[PDB]
Homo-oligomer: A and B are copies of this chain.
């Protein structure tokens, strides 16, 4: 029973608290090494006859990447304290994995033997706002969405050639634009907009931030903004702004002051100037975003700086009732600051959503003391790798999916910002080879996957751009130039979700085969709810089977309505080339 594969730890995803009364304890073991695995537990203060008392509950397998299995144990310890170990049996073999080691039997003379969860505290419980779990985000890039009261920059009118626009130059877009096409989104079905930086800055992208307290004139003013919000909350849309605290622009006052003062500048330590005489020759002589001189790294460890950004994070939450905060290059900021950030904002408006940009494992930030979630780029990676590049397979995709999924405690996943692209990646369509057949499948996956998804403005109407900055083309508002077939598709999925719980906040369950490299079928479940999803990632009609539960009464096809009855053990679903279909099993 290969012990190198078995593993557990009383921290993070392997062990955490779901609610103020339940704990989640997951055990990782080899592929199909263990046929079982019970959870041995008891209060660390429960004894009898000088022997630590404890009972054992069964743990069920909940997935498995390519090599491991992952089991789970939902236990509500009485008095909130509990000591535990695992009893995995693979036939005649019986082991008793414990924090101390393995045992052919369960030690009872001491508690020190087993792993331990001291005390379940609500305060340490990871709790993201419950509302983000039901919404569908739409991220707009102001400088390219919709032009309003032309108080814009003197340059390039709307769109150019069918191809070649987006020249790292302004097109006129502004905040007034969003306020106008608000009904377009309200029709589509999005329940929240995440919009790129809109604070005073000399650039088509306000990342070179010059004044965190003043909205770039070009986009508008506090009034224009005050409207966008009012109107949105009216429609049921939450506005999420972008916080660029990791750095500033060559125009930021303090930094500008480190040029007409230097070492005398009261803002010398506001940055990371290793050597003075501020020389950005071969490259900046101070820390910058990448190597961007016009992007000095701020010193968040500095009391003043820390007090500045923190007054900024609360300003726009007070003066504009915004419902979130996106953190640009959030992973490059000292953990200390973020807990202070979370304390301020969650103290002001507890419902604010703190999202951090982290294209990699962000466990260190999702412990409940900092972020509420991150821009889930790893999932997108897997999605694009399957449907777009068609690199991996249905089983590998299912694995890599069951993987990243398990590397976090449920609640964390239940609030994941599941995007597929953004102002920083090639357009979804160009990535699909122009085959809107695939794009339709991707939207089907995302809008079918639990979490808090987000659509990149252009991508819903068959837009095409590719790698940055081509991915920020001006929005296509031409009813003739925009794929309504695709737009319609996304609109029915967003609603299919809004009404089918399991789709937005339920547990997945893949059913892939090693031989059938192109057949993906998974079931979103949530209590009695079940919404199966068949998919033929092929370019030739296929016959993908789908098992129906005997307890099922009906089998209503979504997006079409064809509602039939189970009465079978399996149902060979026939699909066209890159076809797909959804089913919502009943119960009787």
Q: How far is the CA of A287 from the CA of B31 in the complex (A)?
A: 42
Q: Are A11 and B364 closer than 8 Å at their CB atoms?
A: yes
Residue of B4, B122, B336 touching A68 (CB-CB under 8 A): B4
In the complex where A4-B68, A287-B79 touch, is A115 in contact with B361 (Cβ < 8 A)? yes
Counting chain A residues whose Cβ lies within 8 A of the other chain, the interface size class is: 35 or more
Q: Are B4 and A335 closer than 8 Å at their CB atoms?
A: no
Q: Are A101 and B301 closer than 8 Å at their CB atoms?
A: no
Residue of B11, B67, B123 touching A334 (CB-CB under 8 A): B123
Per-position 1/0 for A339-373, Cβ under 8 A of B: 10000000000000000001111011000010000
Contacts of A116 in B (CB 8 A): 331, 360-361
A 108-133 contacts with B by CB, 8 A: 112, 115-116, 118-119, 121-124
Q: Are A4 and B67 closer than 8 Å at their CB atoms?
A: yes
**Chain B CB within 8 A of A24 CB:** no
Shortest Cβ distance from A270 into chain B, in angstroms? Answer: 16
**Chain B CB within 8 A of A276 CB:** no
**Chain B CB within 8 A of A381 CB:** yes
**Chain B CB within 8 A of A80 CB:** yes
Contacts of A124 in B (CB 8 A): 334-336
Q: Are B301 and A121 closer than 8 Å at their CB atoms?
A: yes
Shortest Cβ distance from A437 into chain B, in angstroms? Answer: 26
**Chain B CB within 8 A of A100 CB:** yes
**Chain B CB within 8 A of A332 CB:** yes
In the complex where A9-B363, A331-B118 touch, is A100 in contact with B381 (Cβ < 8 A)? yes
Q: Are B360 and A99 closer than 8 Å at their CB atoms?
A: yes
**Chain B CB within 8 A of A3 CB:** yes
Shortest Cβ distance from A65 into chain B, in angstroms? Answer: 9
**Chain B CB within 8 A of A144 CB:** no
Contacts of A101 in B (CB 8 A): 400
Q: How far is the CA of A80 from the CA of B358 in the complex (A)?
A: 17
Contacts of A335 in B (CB 8 A): 121, 123-124, 369
In the complex where A123-B336, A301-B123 touch, is A10 in contact with B361 (Cβ < 8 A)? yes
Q: Are B112 and A332 closer than 8 Å at their CB atoms?
A: no
Q: Are B333 and A364 closer than 8 Å at their CB atoms?
A: no
A 285-339 contacts with B by CB, 8 A: 287, 290-291, 301, 331-336, 339
Q: How far is the CA of A364 from the CA of B381 in the complex (A)?
A: 30
Q: How far is the CA of A68 from the CA of B4 in the complex (A)?
A: 7
Residue of B67, B378, B381, B400 touching A3 (CB-CB under 8 A): B67
Q: Are A45 and B290 closer than 8 Å at their CB atoms?
A: yes
Q: Are B10 and A364 closer than 8 Å at their CB atoms?
A: yes
Contacts of A363 in B (CB 8 A): 9-11
A 5-51 contacts with B by CB, 8 A: 5, 9-12, 30-31, 45
**Chain B CB within 8 A of A233 CB:** no
* Residues of A in contact with B (beta carbons under 8 Å apart): 2-5, 9-12, 30-31, 45, 67-68, 79-81, 99-101, 112, 115-116, 118-119, 121-124, 287, 290-291, 301, 331-336, 339, 358-361, 363-364, 369, 377-378, 381, 400
Those 6 A-B pairs whose CB atoms lie nearest each other, nearest first: A121-B334, A118-B331, A4-B5, A45-B290, A119-B332, A116-B360
